[PDB]
Design a protein around this ligand. Sequence first.
Ligand code: H5T
Length: 138
Amino acid sequence: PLIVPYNLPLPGGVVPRMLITILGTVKPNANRIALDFQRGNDVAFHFNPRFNENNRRVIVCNTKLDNNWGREERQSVFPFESGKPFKIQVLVEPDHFKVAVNDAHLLQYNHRVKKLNEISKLGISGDIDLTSASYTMI
Ligand SMILES: Cc1ccc(S[C@@H]2O[C@H](CO)[C@H](O)[C@H](n3cc(-c4c(F)c(F)c(O)c(F)c4F)nn3)[C@H]2O)cc1
């Protein structure tokens, strides 16, 4: 187990067929989780499960460019549960990130930041116990 926030380096950025796996357990009474794939200060892909946004659960996805958030993409399908272990898998594809949670497909997010080879850090934050963060090619 590791303590969050945690920064996972992605040396040389990301590339298609790179699979990033984040394992952890959601705390009881969690409010939020955040994964931030960063190109310097820009956030290419922000993946933000919110456990209570207006009394519902939603996943918010976005990009931050020059410190400004863009247009959000929201997913109501919500595979996380307070107190339960999870696996987030982010598969880099040519035109999008593909996310699966607990071995079930969840969402795709098209690349807004084009320079994949400069998306060189993944930040992991929020109401979790972090078990592991790693990557491999498939
Ligand atoms: C016009 C406008 C008005 C309001 C908003 S709200 C905004 O929405 C964004 C996604 O579009 C991001 O989610 C932002 N955000 C969340 C975290 C964060 C964090 F700082 C942590 F320390 C965590 O542990 C954690 F899990 C987090 F999520 N940082 N920035 C959010 O402030 C947008 C536009």
